[PDB]
Symmetry: D2
């Protein structure tokens, strides 16, 4: 019509900008200069808008997109209105089935590069040269809830990476913990049904805190290992940038000489590991159910590209049987103290999608998509997965041509004798649709395996045994890995695990199920079991108190790589601070605060009791990002209250509650000058407290001290003190 504002302010800057500074936008508009081979290959299907006429799908220009055709301006709508019917038809058919699991997920484009050639252990082309760059598309997800459920639920997270290599798509489809719940794929519908909403009423969404889950767990101790991980703060990551990734299964690397090496895949977050606390996570599902999705997108728009290091645990074929646990058992992890992770390469996620539906929702990842240089093993969970991903994609994406949906296409050549199916895009000119043929001189042709550009040939593993439906006896140990995990956690991590079990079991309506789980905990660790029992009003029996603890794992009592926090890795870049304003802020404080944060790549949001602007002591006009209620402390990592007319907000219950919530969730707080008046709301003593930064002004060491706390993520020593505060 001519509907935009004259200043051009409807349009975000096509340049990196902090979160909240500009409206977010399709990736190709936001970052037009950020390219890779896959992103370039999608140009053929990207559709613009500006300066084009509005048409039907058939290209007929529409004159009046405001009205149906009727007989009289108050008359009945006419069936001949093809423009109305095409328009409503498309709308009526917008939806496709969501993924059966991991329906909720958020995705981005990036690139991967190896640090050195891995030719000695694998002929995989994408790992053959440090100068070889592989486009990726990554989706992170929750597990149980639908595509419209909340982000910060307690759940395992999915971490799936599509590598568009020169010799084929390799999908690495992993999670954020190094084991899974179950051993054999045949049980996946039972486990998933147990954790998903219960079938009579479809409650609860996004939660394992209900009877059927804990019933199944109580009857299937193989689940306890991943359940320990889920109940720990691992189940509630601060963001996808701050969690680990794992392939879980042992796979094989195959080199040019035909040697097989056992491998488990790791992703290490270069930003470090960090999680929420449960009360914060749960509240955040209400205040911002899109928190992780938003955080991912805005990090990328800001330039805080999520980076991950790919690492391999490598085990020689001759060492297959050298551990207390079976390598093929996906409920067991391989302790880094026994087998180190060797760094392999770096993955950087640097561009958001243009259209979430077209790129994210239709993306299809499947762990059967491997490339020469890789192979499978007989892990019975993996073995069944290979069937499932292909099968489910045929309904979810509407037939067997899902690889022609643009996000899914290989960047490399694909030719074969497959034809037809729904939505077929490729128009084949081969005279032949079969081989062997003479009529096209047998093209396209098979290719023998070889060191590079060769055909896929399976590693010739020996198979010997009878056709059985039987769990290997080597898989029948359930408690030592849970115990190993438990003992590796810090005291505050352990408390969080106790609290997770305690909260979940309290939602289980049938008391005998709670009892049964507590009994299982008593096989893992008596201290764990006692603390959970106490929280449930349950008394362990003398028999339970006497259950002997499970054996160590190959002589390991603990392994600190299993803790989120035991070995600090605190990166502050990309984190965010709430600044609580008043109507006459000390402009000197604000210059110091904002500049110090910017120097470390830490973002800020200026909050007030209303939107608009406030004016500082010296006339500086300050734009307000959000209100105290609008952007609660849940959404930030720390809080700073500069000096000024504090009486303006000391009376504001919202401002006080802001600090009390941030205090309760162990976040750093800094109070400059008269802001120290807020000490009383949070019961801070005159002399002070570790984790509260206070000075006459925001000058000197004030910002370094606050940033030091932010590097340590949360203020764990504050835990005994929070029990009392009413928040």
């Amino acid at each position: 019509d001519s509907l935009a504002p004259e200043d051009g302010s409807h349009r975000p800057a096509a340049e990196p900008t902090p979160p909240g500074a500009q409206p977010t936008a399709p990736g190709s508009l936001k970052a037009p200069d950020t390219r890779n081979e896959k992103l370039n290959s999608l140009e053929d299907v990207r559709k613009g808008s500006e300066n084009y006429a509005l048409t039907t799908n058939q290209g007929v220009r529409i004159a009046d997109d405001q009205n149906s055709l009727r007989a009289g301006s108050r008359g009945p709508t006419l069936l001949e209105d093809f423009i109305l019917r095409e328009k409503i038809t498309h709308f009526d058919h917008e939806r496709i089935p969501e993924r059966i699991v991991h329906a909720r997920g958020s995705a981005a484009h990036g690139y991967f590069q190896p640090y050195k050639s891995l030719s000695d252990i694998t002929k995989a082309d994408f790992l053959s040269d440090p100068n070889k760059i592989t486009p990726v598309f990554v989706r992170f997800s929750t597990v149980q809830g639908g595509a419209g459920s909340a982000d910060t639920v307690r759940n395992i997270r999915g971490f799936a990476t599509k590598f568009y290599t020169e010799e084929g798509i390799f999908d690495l489809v992993g999670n954020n913990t190094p084991i899974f719940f179950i051993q054999d794929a045949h049980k996946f519908p039972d486990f998933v049904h147990a954790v998903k909403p219960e079938p009579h009423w479809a409650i609860p969404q996004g939660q394992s805190a209900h009877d059927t889950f804990w019933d199944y767990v109580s009857l299937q101790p193989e689940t306890l290992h991943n359940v320990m991980w889920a109940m720990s703060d691992r189940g509630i990551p601060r963001s996808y940038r701050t969690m680990e990734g794992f392939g879980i299964h042992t796979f094989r690397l195959i080199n040019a000489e035909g040697k097989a090496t056992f491998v488990r895949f790791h992703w290490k977050p270069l930003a470090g590991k960090a999680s929420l606390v449960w009360d914060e996570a749960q509240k955040l599902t209400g205040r911002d159910p899109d928190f992780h999705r938003r955080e991912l997108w805005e990090a990328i728009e800001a330039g805080d590209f999520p980076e991950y290091e790919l690492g391999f645990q490598l085990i020689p074929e001759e060492d297959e049987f050298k551990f207390d646990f079976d390598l093929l058992d996906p409920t067991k992890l391989i302790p880094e103290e026994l087998v180190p992770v060797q760094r392999v390469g770096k993955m950087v996620l640097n561009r958001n999608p243009d259209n979430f539906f077209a790129e994210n929702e239709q993306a299809a990842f499947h762990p059967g998509h491997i490339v020469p240089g890789l192979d499978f093993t007989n892990d019975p969970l993996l073995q069944g997965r290979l069937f499932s991903y292909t099968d489910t994609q045929i309904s979810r994406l509407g037939g067997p041509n899902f690889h022609e949906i643009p996000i899914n296409r290989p960047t490399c050549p694909y030719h074969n004798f497959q034809r037809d199916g729904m939505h077929r895009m490729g128009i084949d000119t081969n005279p032949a649709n079969y081989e062997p043929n003479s009529i096209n001189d047998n093209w396209p042709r098979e290719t023998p395996p070889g060191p590079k550009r060769g055909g896929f040939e399976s590693y010739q593993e020996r198979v010997e045994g009878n056709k059985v439906r039987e769990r290997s006896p080597s898989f029948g140990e359930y408690y030592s890995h849970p115990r190993l995990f438990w003992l590796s956690q810090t005291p505050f991590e352990q408390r969080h695990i106790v609290d997770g079990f305690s909260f979940e079991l309290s939602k289980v309506v049938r008391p005998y199920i709670r009892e049964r789980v507590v009994d299982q905990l008593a096989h893992i660790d008596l201290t764990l079991a006692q603390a959970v029992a106490k929280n449930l009003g349950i008394e362990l029996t003398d028999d339970q108190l006497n259950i002997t603890p499970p054996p160590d794992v190959n002589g390991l009592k603990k392994d600190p790589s299993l803790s989120l926090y035991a070995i600090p890795d605190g990166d502050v870049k990309g984190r965010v601070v709430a600044i609580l304003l008043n109507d006459e802020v000390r402009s000197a404080d604000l210059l110091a605060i904002l500049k110090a944060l910017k120097a470390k790549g830490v973002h800020a949001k200026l909050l007030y009791s209303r939107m608009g602007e406030v004016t500082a002591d010296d006339g500086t006009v300050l734009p307000i990002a959000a209100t105290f209620a609008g952007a609660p402390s849940l959404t930030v990592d720390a809080v700073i209250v500069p000096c000024g007319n504090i009486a303006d907000i000391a009376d504001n219950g919202d401002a006080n509650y802001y600090l009390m919530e941030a205090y309760k969730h162990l976040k750093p707080i800094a109070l400059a000058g008269d802001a120290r008046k807020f000490k009383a709301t949070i019961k801070i003593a005159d002399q002070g407290e570790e984790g509260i930064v206070e000075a006459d002004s925001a000058d000197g060491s004030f910002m370094d001290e606050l940033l030091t706390l932010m590097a340590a993520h949360r203020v764990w020593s504050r835990i005994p003190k929070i029990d009392k505060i009413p928040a």
Copy 2:
């Protein structure tokens, strides 16, 4: 690898060749330099073959495309064989639902151009300039049978043209007769269920010759006009090249002034009109159920492009009520004697598709696809069609993005706010998915209607009446048009109509249905009614004998434009002659025969009793295309038998049958020298018979006479004589 022969017999010449001379091939390989804007724009999706490795759809090279992965070479197949499962999955899912009606069809690419600007009567961009070339894709079809049914059934034929214009796709979805069976779209499922295979047992395929069809006709006299056409030889076209097309409905042309002109659309076959005879068509359904599909493909490969002239019958809006039938009634034709067809442009079909499934099977034509400069009318059959074609495509082609299937895509721009849907190809970058919007300055934007490049606005027809489900009384006349058609036919055409009704009704099991049909015929014409009654063992009553004939149509008793044959327009270019060989043929006959045929662009096929070659009297080596039994006379337009050692064939039962059959089917036969020994088998007297060419040798005059017979198509004078030959 080395499977093609080194001589190169495996690959057809990239140049026009006669039917049977080379193996047929994908259009882009056969005629790589036949181009138009649509065919060029499909290049992004054309996939080649030669010199590429065989891969999975994920781009992984396959080493052994001969074996499943098993444990041991005689062991069980393993679930981890992703290469097998992908290949079998795609195969398992190749099929999509066939079209509900017109499932059986054959298609080709071409182009249209107008003869002059039609801007005085329509602002349609494709009709504005004789230098505007519009790509087309045209699909011809039968109605009833499945996609696997036979071509030369007795049926109406579909003639659908997709015009890819600069202002939108216009689909002109017509048939080969100028009316339809029914008046209101609400009855379409009734009619189509009646004609389709009966629901208990699903018989018969591709035939209206069964009880339910004639039951419905007998009860719904509106059907009789199109039934007359179907029972005539119109129902069995020689080829899609030799039949007329009609839009059936009155539509509107709208000019820049906004004036509406009523129009009915016509296609005139520039090759002329020509049909098979019933016995030939029925036999052809068994010997070559692909006859018309083949004939189209091979005509195009030979450079014998199907050509049609677009014609308009134009009626001023003020003349709406000037006829004694209703213009909106699709069971009524507009006699050309009353409203002539203005010749408007020419369409040429000049390239076969590359892949039948991708381009023909997936093509989607819908009469609701119009463009500015065209509009609908209230014709109640057309009105309901508008709903159906959009609706059916949603399931047949798997969702609302069927316009992104390559063959269906407009060549002109399309931009709107529609999103998602199964198999969404387009990746939208517009910040906005709604209008009005400010965030993308309201683009894409509506366009006011105008003289050129304007938005679509419906013609503001006055609607006055009550909401009623009621047939207009103006539509309640059923016999006068059937009569006009009957009286317009030649005597042999009338006899073939009688024979069609008689043959169908003889297969109707319930005698009362046959009698009710003969009663309806008595309301049309008494001679027709008596002739059919007589063949059915039925005696017209006193009453039936005295039914008053229906009136003339605006004083017209007949209109020669409704006969296939009454007015000569015959043409031989692209027809075919079988030449019956012997072991020592008179080379001089062959040279003259072949020279004369080539001169007129008529093709020859050389037949004998075995494959291989024979040698002519003078050592000329003649290659044999097929055997007498392997390429029966059904498949050719005429038969010539040259001189030589006729004893080699004169006792060949098949050689005789060939001539008896061709004779039965009223085809021109030419006999040279010792070929005249065959005259005995078809009981021809020594003084000749019109339609049998015979001379001492195959001279220049002998060929001239034969080509004259071929231009008149069949020897109608022979009909009274075919009684007495057992073939």
Copy 3:
């Protein structure tokens, strides 16, 4: 209304009648006294018609099933016509994909009974008791052509039997020759693409008589055994009644003791083996493309029930 004839000759006799004597009818109207456990359990989804009002699928009685709702009797059809749109919508969506292979097929209900208990060699319940009667549904078919292709093509034929046993459905999915064309399932798409209509033009229907099939055969000698069968008169059976059936593969029988016995399955036509000749078969594809479907239906209606051992 007055629509049926007064003498009642619109209605086929509900008793066995020879081919062509009466119009064919749905099995439960033609032979209402024939029953088996499976046919009896289908009764809850059978829908009648006599004396009922014509309705929408939501159960709304329709008054005028001859016309669309329009503004004026010569006016535009209105979008509010939900009776018209439901009717056209269901019509528009009648089709489902045909089978990838064996799309052309004809089927009938029947029953199976073993001569004696085979418990010594298999614990399969349907073979445990000469008194145990097992309902069946059997579909015979060609291989290559679409559902709308002709019956009497030269083709291998399918012979598929669904046994509704008390311990599960057993499907015996066989052909009318004892072997197949290929050795490993991986090549199935290759062989079937080769035999099916060629991908550029989709010709020919229902026939192996084209280049790509014989190309494949010439390059894959394993196909020669079944090709010999197909080129013989086995490829053109007189009717589904007079052909053999075979499971082809070796399967196992497992008895209560756990003993495996290797087994190949056979169907013997009790009407004897008989085939057409090629010229007769080809001509019949033209004159009656439904000849085998018709033959099967009409035999059953006449009481010449197909029997197999």
Copy 4:
């Protein structure tokens, strides 16, 4: 049609009428009803035209639209009275 997989959604148990439904519609994905009507079209004689149309009337009658008067040109236009 897409959400419930085809035109037989009325045969999904929760959606089924409890009152009689009979017509000449056939087929469609997941067809549950097995029709025995020799006829799948009307008018038919072979089943004496059943199931039959029912005139409108006071009770148990066929649906007939209220015969509202329609007067106007074919327009894509918002009524001024809505503004």
